[PDB]
Amino acid sequence: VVGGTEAQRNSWPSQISLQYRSGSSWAHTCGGTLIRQNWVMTAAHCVDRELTFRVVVGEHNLNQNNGTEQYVGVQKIVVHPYWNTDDVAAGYDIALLRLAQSVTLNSYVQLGVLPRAGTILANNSPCYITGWGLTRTNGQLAQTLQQAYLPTVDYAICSSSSYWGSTVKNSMVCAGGDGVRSGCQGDSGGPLHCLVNGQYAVHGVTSFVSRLGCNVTRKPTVFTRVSAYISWINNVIASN
Ligand SMILES: *[C@](=O)([C]([N]C(=O)[C]N1C(=O)C([N])=[C]N=C1C1=[C][C]=[C]S1)[C]([C])[C])C(F)(F)C(=O)[N][C][C]N1[C][C]O[C][C]1
Ligand code: NA
C-alpha cells in the first residue's frame, strides 16, 4: 500500500496473508479475506502458480511474533471458470481457497461481511484498502498491515478515456487515482472495505494497477467487484 498508515491490530480482522513456501521459509505473496471459518477469498492471479500455499490469520507484523496468529494450510483452490491467466483486464480475477482446518474466531480473526448481489457503490464512496504490499513503486513489502483511504470512482468516470478506458469492465470497481495512495505489489487478493449503512463490507478483491507504477494520477487501483460474484461464491461453498 503506497501512501498508507499502519493499521491498528484489531481494525480489519478478516484480512489474511497468503504465503507460499520458498526454501525453508514461507513468503507473503498476496492478501485475502476470510469469508467462512474455512474459506478464503482472494485473486485468481495469486494462486495461478503450482506452489504450496498457507494462510496466516490474526497477522499484524510479518516478521515478528504477534502472539495472535493461526497458520492453516490450503486444501482446495477453486479459481473462477472464466479466468484467463494472461488476462487481468478480462476479469474473473477471483478464487476461493478451502482451508485444511477451520480457524478460531476472536477479535483478531473475524469473517468479512459481503455485499448483497448487484450492489453498486456511488461515486466517491468511503473505502479503505489494506495490505502488506510495496509501500513505494519498486519498493519493499510492509512489515505491519498498512491501510489507505481510497474513495471509489464509478464506472463511467473510470472507463472514461483519461482514466482506464476499456481496460476496466463493469465487474470491477475502481478506487483511488490521486497519485498519492494506492495498492501495490503484494496487496493483490486483499479487501477493499467500504462503509455502507454504518457497517464495513468487502466490496472488492485487489486486482491490478498501472504498468507505470502503483500510485499514478488518474489510474485508480482496480478491484474485482465482489457483488458481481455472490452467486458463484455461494455455489462453490455449497458444493465443496
Ligand atoms: C498483486 O499484488 C498486484 N497485482 C498485479 O500485479 C496484477 N497485474 C497488474 O497489476 C498489472 N499492471 C499487470 N498485470 C498484472 C498481472 C497479471 C497476471 C499476474 S499479475 C498488485 C499491484 C495489486 C500481485 F500480482 F499478486 C503481486 O504483485 N504479488 C506479488 C508480490 N510480491 C511479493 C514479494 O515481493 C515482491 C512483491
Ligand atoms: Na506476526
Side-chain angles (χ1 to χ4, degrees):
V1 171
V2 183
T5 56
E6 185 190 340
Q8 182 179 311
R9 286 183 182 266
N10 54 353
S11 306
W12 315 108
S14 64
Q15 170 86 56
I16 69 87
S17 170
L18 189 60
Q19 302 172 356
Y20 63 100
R21 186 194 290 105
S22 64
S24 304
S25 28
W26 293 81
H28 170 92
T29 192
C30 281
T33 306
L34 188 74
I35 56 174
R36 287 306 184 296
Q37 279 191 332
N38 58 173
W39 279 101
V40 169
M41 173 183 69
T42 184
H45 82 246
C46 286
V47 291
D48 262 350
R49 204 187 286 120
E50 328 261 358
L51 264 15
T52 309
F53 292 103
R54 78 158 175 200
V55 159
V56 183
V57 297
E59 185 72 288
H60 181 59
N61 186 317
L62 293 181
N63 32 68
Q64 269 168 244
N65 177 63
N66 291 132
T68 51
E69 310 87 315
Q70 303 177 45
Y71 308 87
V72 206
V74 183
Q75 81 163 345
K76 200 180 205 299
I77 291 164
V78 188
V79 169
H80 196 278
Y82 280 157
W83 168 245
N84 200 26
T85 304
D86 43 54
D87 231 342
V88 103
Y92 306 107
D93 200 357
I94 185 161
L96 295 186
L97 323 183
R98 182 122 66 72
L99 308 194
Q101 200 52 211
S102 302
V103 298
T104 291
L105 311 185
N106 49 51
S107 49
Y108 307 101
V109 187
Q110 290 287 284
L111 310 178
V113 352
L114 305 179
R116 183 209 140 257
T119 302
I120 298 297
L121 296 169
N123 190 57
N124 218 75
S125 292
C127 305
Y128 282 88
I129 177 182
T130 49
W132 293 272
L134 308 205
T135 53
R136 192 148 191 188
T137 294
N138 295 323
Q140 56 190 118
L141 297 184
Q143 290 171 246
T144 57
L145 187 67
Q146 300 292 296
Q147 71 177 53
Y149 186 65
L150 232 59
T152 64
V153 178
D154 67 39
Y155 180 75
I157 300 169
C158 203
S159 62
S160 81
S161 48
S162 35
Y163 286 74
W164 278 102
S166 309
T167 302
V168 72
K169 316 298 186 284
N170 192 227
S171 53
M172 303 169 181
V173 31
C174 305
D178 70 338
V180 182
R181 303 110 126 189
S182 72
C184 204
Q185 283 75 15
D187 299 322
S188 284
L192 173 65
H193 314 270
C194 302
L195 185 67
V196 175
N197 286 330
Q199 173 191 257
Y200 274 113
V202 186
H203 288 240
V205 168
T206 313
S207 192
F208 68 88
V209 298
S210 175
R211 299 207 206 110
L212 307 180
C214 297
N215 60 302
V216 173
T217 302
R218 291 193 158 174
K219 291 283 184 298
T221 298
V222 194
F223 306 73
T224 297
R225 185 160 66 78
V226 177
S227 57
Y229 302 84
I230 297 322
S231 43
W232 176 74
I233 297 174
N234 299 139
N235 278 150
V236 178
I237 301 174
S239 59
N240 286 276

